[PDB]
Curated annotation (Swiss-Prot), chain B:
<dbReference type="GO" id="GO:0000461">
    <property type="term" value="P:endonucleolytic cleavage to generate mature 3'-end of SSU-rRNA from (SSU-rRNA, 5.8S rRNA, LSU-rRNA)"/>
</dbReference>
<dbReference type="GO" id="GO:0010494">
    <property type="term" value="C:cytoplasmic stress granule"/>
</dbReference>
<dbReference type="GO" id="GO:0000054">
    <property type="term" value="P:ribosomal subunit export from nucleus"/>
</dbReference>
<keyword id="KW-0689">Ribosomal protein</keyword>
<dbReference type="GO" id="GO:0005829">
    <property type="term" value="C:cytosol"/>
</dbReference>
Curated annotation (Swiss-Prot), chain D:
<dbReference type="GO" id="GO:0000028">
    <property type="term" value="P:ribosomal small subunit assembly"/>
</dbReference>
<dbReference type="InterPro" id="IPR001210">
    <property type="entry name" value="Ribosomal_eS17"/>
</dbReference>
<dbReference type="GO" id="GO:0003735">
    <property type="term" value="F:structural constituent of ribosome"/>
</dbReference>
<keyword id="KW-0687">Ribonucleoprotein</keyword>
<dbReference type="GO" id="GO:0002181">
    <property type="term" value="P:cytoplasmic translation"/>
</dbReference>
Curated annotation (Swiss-Prot), chain E:
<dbReference type="GO" id="GO:0005829">
    <property type="term" value="C:cytosol"/>
</dbReference>
<dbReference type="GO" id="GO:0006412">
    <property type="term" value="P:translation"/>
</dbReference>
<keyword id="KW-0687">Ribonucleoprotein</keyword>
<dbReference type="InterPro" id="IPR038579">
    <property type="entry name" value="Ribosomal_eS21_sf"/>
</dbReference>
<feature type="modified residue" description="N-acetylmethionine">
    <location>
        <position position="1"/>
    </location>
</feature>
Swiss-Prot record, chain F:
<dbReference type="GO" id="GO:1990145">
    <property type="term" value="P:maintenance of translational fidelity"/>
</dbReference>
<dbReference type="GO" id="GO:0022627">
    <property type="term" value="C:cytosolic small ribosomal subunit"/>
</dbReference>
<dbReference type="GO" id="GO:0005829">
    <property type="term" value="C:cytosol"/>
</dbReference>
<comment type="similarity">
    <text>Belongs to the universal ribosomal protein uS12 family.</text>
</comment>
<keyword id="KW-1017">Isopeptide bond</keyword>
Length: 129, 206, 217, 125, 87, 96
RNA sequence: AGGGGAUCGAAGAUGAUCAGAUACCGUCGUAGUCUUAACCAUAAACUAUGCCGACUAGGGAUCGGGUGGUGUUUUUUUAAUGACCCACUCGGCACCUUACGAGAAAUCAAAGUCUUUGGGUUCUGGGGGGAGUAUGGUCGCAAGGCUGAAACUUAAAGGAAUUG
């Protein structure tokens, strides 16, 4: 069944970006999908998105530019020591310059560079570029 | 970015409806649904001819904008389009390919039919498929006359009309050329209707 | 001498196009190798492989030659071509003609920091052809070109300095290998990196500023 | 097979293509005409060509051939313009100043905001 | 793309498609550029002023080139009441 | 889902599966069955002295006929008979 | 193990011919084929495509349900139904196109969203033979099934496509 929401969300977004569409309709939504998207947005990988109430669990409509090569979810949210980040970013992202392996820490969800700065770490959600 | 002039004239619309350009075929590609106005109880669709018009004006602005009026290519293997296109070429000085479009007329610099357009206009995007396909190999924009069941692959600015009946065809071509010449300056004012009859464009066989 | 037959050729011979960068920017399809010749003077070829091929034409058995040839600036331009002819030097000739034709740019960039000239690649890329995949990864400077002979030549002749590769599949078929590698460098200019986000104003084609010129007589 | 070599057929084709007037069904005048209009290096090959222009001249007096006739082409160019009807089908006068049209097409015209003389001929299946 | 001295160091900033914001690349012979003519009050189009669009070979092959052109033009003042934002 | 468990508390299933699957490797099977100490004529050593039992004129036909000047040797440590090549020697004046 | 035992028919019984177009072929025919109670657990048991979930192109069909129609045929005096027709809609079922995509290719709406490699989970494979053999264990009245090696041997065995 629908085991991870984040997974299907990011899947939808990706597929849509490949087709070259301009908007997607994610369902359902989560505190996590919300935060993940806010981080996606902060670096401008997507335009603006709207949460649609319906009392169940909302839908989301995401508008996207075209700046999204691939976003994905790394699946079993492995834990990561701080020194370990380097290895993940050495695999997933296409380049040392840009891209973002975004984590879940006890100090909220955020990209890995903010994890570098705040000096914390946690589990690893997914990755954007 | 266009004056209150360019809007559809009562006369024009009369012409269109007289030639049944508004009569669309029985099936609609999901790609041309916005063109469809309403569907008749017999299963025949109706085209927003306002949109037919605006797309005509567009295709015209494009045909206009090309620096050398020779490069634009009208095409048709379709019977009716032959006649119409020929005239189009005459009054507009574009180059014409009536009848059999020789393959590799856009690739292959060695053959004698080799031409290097900067815009292709096509009557039927199905019967003239290969010209579209071939234009796609060499960055050449296609502007077609599509019915509501015409493959909109490798075409930009489709003109929704009626590829079936000869009146529709001739009329559309003629309107096209006329609009072009109105844009160049060749037919000075816009109140002046074309001295030339659309019937010159119609397909006649003895 | 040479007589152009294409409204891109007459543009070139009349010195109306300086660099290839103006061909590439607008994707104007080359069909006259002399174009590449004048625009790329410092193009140094290299026959990668020569192979006796047994033809059987209507009970008449013949021996021809298949030649895999690479060309390139040691700046940012490559080309690859395969050709079969009846005579070896003829094959090589024709091969170089073909590779001249299919010349491609390359986005070469930095590893991490940002000093001097761009040395390696910009991002990880991957080409696939046949069963073979070839993957190219940014190296740090002075890491040389880590690849088998063939792919190494192709990258050297394309002004890559530092690049890790990873292949997969039957890499022993050198034509698929070369083709695939070729694809992978030919994808670099195709990966939208954030420093290319800034909207440009659309350039107006050489074909329209110089349209009166290079028009057929 | 007495199949005439390509030089004879091609020369016959061209000679009749530009000099249809002075050639008849007779070989004896087509021959001396082939002497006065053309420069053939041999008498035998000239008899070949002039004789085949004789046969072909006997084939063109009955019907139009796959070649080029300018006497025809001028009128084929006139014919293209000749029949431009004084009142086409696209002139409203052909239906009493009214346009016979469907309920839905009339809806369309009403929606565009265009005043046209329309007769609403309703349709069904 | 710059280096440390602040100077650009590419072969070329490439053309992006207008519908899709993806990059058009050099071997893409299905990509296209569309010049539409700027017009005078007298309905004459000026010889050298265009509103131009770019289209990826992808969008033209997929058969969305048209609808894309519509939206684009309509939003850039060329058309009106052709293209709906809703369907 | 690429047919293997991918869960975070799934290690046991993974590694067990790996152990059950390494028995299709060839060398691994040799190495945990002690095939070298139980069967291999050398007993798992780089060399063995033996005493020439019989001078063999084997004849090995296709595609190239070796007038196989080989030997039956019996290894001293196993009392185990073996055949062996005696290289570079045309006449076998060296090995009796 | 009973009942049944028409047809057809492994076994078997009998004939043949007459030639190397060859024993088909023939005629009986026992078990079997049908069933009742037990067993057996295997097939090219095949879509040679595990199951759940999400997403990503059109087009013809059709099967099942549903919503709409001052649509049609059915007369009685108009309905009511019922079949049909059009539009839509879930759920099937096959087909026809393509490819953005995959693939070694044939081909594939999944065999796609896979080096830009991670939605959950089960099972299986690691050159060809030796061999589904030996041995043990287990299930079966038996025929057998399940589980299942090694020594030794070998440079290929194999896939798909292409020319003659
Ligand atoms: Mg390998
Ligand atoms: Mg089985
Ligand atoms: Mg099976
Ligand atoms: Mg094995």
């Amino acid at each position: 069944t629908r085991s991870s929401v984040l997974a299907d969300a990011l899947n939808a977004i990706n597929n849509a970006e490949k087709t070259g569409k301009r908007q997607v309709l994610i369902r359902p939504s989560s505190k996590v999908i919300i935060k993940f998207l806010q981080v996606m947005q902060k670096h401008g990988y997507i335009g603006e998105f709207e949460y649609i109430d319906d009392h169940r669990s909302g839908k989301i409509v995401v508008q996207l530019n075209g700046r999204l090569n691939k976003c994905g979810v790394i699946s079993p949210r492995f834990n990561v020591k701080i020194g370990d980040i380097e290895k993940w970013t050495a695999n997933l992202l296409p380049a040392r310059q840009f891209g973002y392996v975004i984590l879940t820490t006890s100090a909220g969800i955020m990209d890995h560079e903010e994890a570098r700065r705040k000096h914390v770490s946690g589990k690893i959600l997914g990755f954007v570029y | 970015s266009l004056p209150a002039t360019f809007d559809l004239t009562p006369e024009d619309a009369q012409l269109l409806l007289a030639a049944n350009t508004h009569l669309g075929a029985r099936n609609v590609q999901v790609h041309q649904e916005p063109y469809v106005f309403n569907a008749r109880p017999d299963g025949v669709h109706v085209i927003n001819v306002g949109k037919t018009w605006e797309k005509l004006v567009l295709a015209a602005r494009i045909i206009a904008a090309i620096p050398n009026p020779e490069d634009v290519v009208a095409i048709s293997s379709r019977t009716f389009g032959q006649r119409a296109v020929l005239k189009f070429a005459a009054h507009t000085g574009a180059t014409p390919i009536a009848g059999r479009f020789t393959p590799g007329s856009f690739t292959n610099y060695i053959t004698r039919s080799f031409k290097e357009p900067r815009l292709v206009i096509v009557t039927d995007p199905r019967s003239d498929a290969q010209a579209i396909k071939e234009a796609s190999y060499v960055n050449i924009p296609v502007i077609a006359l599509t019915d509501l069941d015409s493959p909109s692959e490798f075409v930009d600015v489709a003109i929704p009309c009626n590829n079936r009946g000869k009146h529709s065809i001739g009329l559309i071509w003629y309107l096209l050329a006329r609009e072009v010449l109105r844009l160049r300056g060749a037919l000075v004012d816009r109140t002046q209707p074309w001295s030339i009859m659309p019937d010159l464009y119609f397909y006649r066989f003895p | 001498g040479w007589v152009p037959v294409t409204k891109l050729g007459r543009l070139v011979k009349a010195g109306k196009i300086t660099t290839i960068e103006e061909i590439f920017l607008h994707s104007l399809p080359v069909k006259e190798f002399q174009i590449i010749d004048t625009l790329l003077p410092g193009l140094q070829d290299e026959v990668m492989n020569i192979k006796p091929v047994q033809k059987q034409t209507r009970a008449g058995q013949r021996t021809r030659f298949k030649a895999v040839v690479v060309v390139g600036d040691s700046n940012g331009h490559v080309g690859l071509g395969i050709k079969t002819a009846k005579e070896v030097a003829g094959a090589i000739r024709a091969g170089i003609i073909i590779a001249k034709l299919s010349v491609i740019p390359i986005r070469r960039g930095y590893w991490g920091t940002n000093l001097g000239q761009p040395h390696s690649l910009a991002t990880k890329t991957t080409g696939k052809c046949g069963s073979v995949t070839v993957r190219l990864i940014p190296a740090p400077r002075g890491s040389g070109i880590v690849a088998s002979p063939a792919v190494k030549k192709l990258l050297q002749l394309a002004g890559v300095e530092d690049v890790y590769t990873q292949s997969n599949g039957k890499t022993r078929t050198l034509e698929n290998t070369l083709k695939a590698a070729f694809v992978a460098i030919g994808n670099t200019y195709g990966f939208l990196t954030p420093n290319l986000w800034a909207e440009q104003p659309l350039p107006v084609s050489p074909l329209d500023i110089y349209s009166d010129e290079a028009s057929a007589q | 097979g007495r199949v005439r070599t390509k030089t004879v057929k091609r020369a016959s084709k061209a000679l009749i293509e530009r000099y249809y007037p002075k050639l008849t069904l007779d070989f004896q005048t087509n021959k001396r005409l082939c002497d006065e209009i053309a420069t053939i290096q041999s008498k035998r090959l000239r008899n070949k060509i002039a004789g085949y222009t004789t046969h072909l001249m006997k084939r063109i007096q009955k019907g139009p051939v796959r070649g080029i006739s300018f006497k025809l082409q001028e009128e084929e160019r006139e014919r293209k313009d000749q029949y431009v009807p004084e009142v086409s089908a696209l002139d409203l006068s052909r239906s009493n100043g009214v346009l016979n049209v469907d309920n839905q097409t009339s809806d369309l015209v009403k929606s565009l905001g265009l005043k046209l003389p329309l007769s609403v001929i309703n349709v069904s299946a | 793309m710059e280096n440390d001295k602040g100077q650009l160091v590419e072969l070329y900033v490439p053309r992006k498609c207008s519908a899709t914001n993806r990059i058009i690349k050099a071997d893409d012979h299905a990509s296209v550029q569309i010049n539409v003519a700027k017009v005078d009050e007298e309905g004459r189009a000026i010889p050298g002023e265009y509103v131009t669009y770019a289209l990826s070979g992808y969008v033209r092959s997929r058969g969305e080139s048209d609808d894309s052109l519509n939206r684009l033009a309509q939003n850039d003042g060329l058309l009106k009441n052709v293209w709906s934002y809703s369907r | 889902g690429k047919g293997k468990p991918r869960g975070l508390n799934s290690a046991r299933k993974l590694r067990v599966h790996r152990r059950n699957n390494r028995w299709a490797e060839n060398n691994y099977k040799k190495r945990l069955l002690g095939t070298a100490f139980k069967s291999s004529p050398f007993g798992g050593s780089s060399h063995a002295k033996g005493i020439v039992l019989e001078k063999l004129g084997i004849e090995s036909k296709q595609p190239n006929s070796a007038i196989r000047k080989c030997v039956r040797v019996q290894l001293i440590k196993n009392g185990k008979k073996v055949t062996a090549f005696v290289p570079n020697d045309g006449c076998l004046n060296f090995v009796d």
